[PDB]
Swiss-Prot record:
Superkingdom, taxonomy of origin: Eukaryota
Main location: secreted
Function comment: Possesses prevalent extracellular endopeptidase activity at low pH condition. Required for high-density growth in acidic environments. Broad substrate specificity with preference cleavage of the peptide substrate between hydrophobic amino acids. Cleaves substrate at P1-P1' between Phe-Leu. Positively charged amino acids are preferred at P2. Prefers hydrophobic amino acids at the P3 and P4 positions. Cleaves substrate also at P1'-P2' between Leu-Val to some degree. Required for virulence in mouse inhalation model of infection.
Binding positions for pepstatin A per the UniProt entry: 36, 76, 78-79, 201, 235-236
Subunit structure: Monomer.
Protein name, per record: Major aspartyl peptidase 1
Catalytic residues as annotated in Swiss-Prot or TrEMBL: 34, 232
EC number, UniProt record: 3.4.23.-
Subcellular location field: Secreted
Regulation: Activated by low pH. Inhibited by pepstatin A with an IC(50) of 1.4 nM. Inhibited by acetyl pepstatin. Inhibited by HIV antiretroviral therapy protease inhibitors including amprenavir and ritonavir. Inhibited by HIV-1 protease inhibitor brecanavir with an approximate IC(50) of 352 nM. Inhibited by HIV-1 protease inhibitors CGP53437 and GS-8374. From the tested peptidomimetic inhibitor molecules, macrocycles containing P2-P3' tethered side chains, statines in P1 and an alpha amino acid in P2' are the best.
Intrachain S-S bonds: 47-52, 272-306
Record note on disruption phenotype: Loss of endopeptidase activity in microbial minimal medium YNB (yeast nitrogen base) pH 5.0 as almost total loss of endopeptidase cleavage events of the substrate, but also a substantially decreased carboxypeptidase activity. Lower Cryptococcus cell density than wild-type at saturation when grown in YNB in acidic conditions. Growth defect at pH 3.5, but not at pH 5.0 or 6.5, after 48 hours. Cryptococcus cells are growth-defective in the lungs of the infected mouse host.
Length: 350
């Protein structure tokens, strides 16, 4: 079989979310679809955080199939963390069901992790990085032979650069579970193979980067000659090692690091009237990033300067990834996440 999740684009390409349903009878939630993590969680109805007061929450007491657990749930993202306890219940998405899906019932988070209309997050990466130890929903489906083809196809719609766009766009893209949507891409899919040691994040090697026509050195202390890049639908921008970010912005005349005084340490800005030409090389092909994705607008009162989508994020030397490649990149390609043989594919959008 196949099944489609319609995506809502929240926050001007900040987060892409789809509907999950949990419990009996079903309780429905809009959750971040996150190819950079592997746990499902939803804000619980007992949560006393302010955001929980203003969004839909999961009432464990009104699900007749809910199996409680005292086991703690704790997950950390680059943007913050979420805590609560594990639970088990029937979960559906895209017309599929997992009867005894383990997930987090969250009752605290770091400030501003999520808000209305979101209620949680569904991890689309591999079991080995699931904090809960549970097999991810998507992975159960793939492993069971339920899918026509063992892959997920992703389209993220772009609103950044549209001056009349809303903070909630329900026409936000699509995830196809169990195949690729041939109406949304053109030409052949270029698959980059992922070996058995790399089934954690969805990650692939960066071969090269070109900005303003200059090939940037992508060597790093953590990642050696070539970084391993999380292809991460759950992040907004492109996070890279500090050294690499410095090198990137050195290729744009007039670029400078934003001071920590601004409140934007790790970000860089450059002249707003410079259209930046930039591509990332994966699997022997260059993939362009449109100027509408690259230019985030002015972050300070100096309106002649605009912030770029690449930012400095030094990561744990315990991380297997040195780049986090978010929606800023992904909006420019149709993306296939292939379970078997394990691979990430890219195609030109139609
Ligand atoms: C592939 O993507 C296309 C384009 O988004 C989907 O087409 C829509 O499907 C719905 C109902 O299934 C129609 O009512 C819409 O009018 C279609 N939109 C357009 C622009 O044609 C299509 O459903 C997707 N296919 C799969 C299998 O997910
Ligand atoms: Na993530
Ligand atoms: Na420099």
């Amino acid at each position: 079989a196949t099944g489609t999740v319609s995506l809502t684009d929240v926050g001007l390409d900040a987060s892409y979310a789809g509907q999950v349903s949990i419990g009996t009878p079903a309780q429905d939630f809009l959750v971040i679809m996150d190819s950079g993590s592997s746990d499902l969680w939803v804000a619980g109805s007992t949560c006393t955080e302010n955001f929980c007061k203003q969004t839909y929450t999961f009432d464990t007491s009104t699900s007749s199939s809910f199996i409680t657990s005292s086991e703690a749930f704790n997950i950390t993202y680059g943007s913050g963390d979420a805590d609560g306890t594990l639970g088990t219940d029937t979960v559906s998405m895209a017309g599929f069901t997992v009867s005894d899906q383990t997930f987090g019932v969250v009752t605290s988070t770091s400030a501003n992790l999520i808000s209305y209309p979101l209620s949680g997050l569904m991890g689309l990466a591999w079991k080995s990085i699931a904090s809960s130890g549970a097999t991810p929903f998507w992975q159960t489906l793939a492993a069971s032979g339920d899918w026509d083809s063992p892959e997920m196809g992703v389209y993220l719609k772009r609103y950044r650069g549209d001056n009349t766009a809303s903070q909630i766009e329900t026409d936000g893209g699509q995830i196809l579970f169990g195949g690729l949507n041939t109406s949304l891409y053109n030409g052949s899919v270029n698959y980059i193979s992922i070996d058995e040691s790399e089934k954690d994040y969805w990650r692939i090697p960066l071969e090269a980067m070109v900005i303003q026509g200059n090939s940037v050195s992508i060597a790093s202390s953590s990642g050696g000659s070539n970084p391993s890049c999380a292809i991460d639908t759950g992040t907004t921008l492109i996070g890279v090692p500090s050294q690499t970010a410095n090198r990137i912005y050195s290729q744009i005349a007039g670029a400078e690091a934003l001071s920590a005084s601004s409140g934007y340490e790790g970000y860089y800005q450059y002249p707003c009237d410079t259209e930046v030409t930039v591509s990332l090389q994966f699997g022997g092909m260059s993939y362009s990033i449109s100027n509408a994705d690259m230019n985030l607008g002015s972050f300070t009162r100096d309106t002649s300067m605009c912030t770029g989508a690449f930012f400095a994020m030094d990561m744990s030397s315990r991380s297997p990834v040195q780049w986090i490649v978010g929606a800023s990149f992904i909006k420019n390609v149709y993306t296939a996440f292939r379970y078997n043989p394990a691979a990430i594919g890219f195609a030109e959008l139609v």
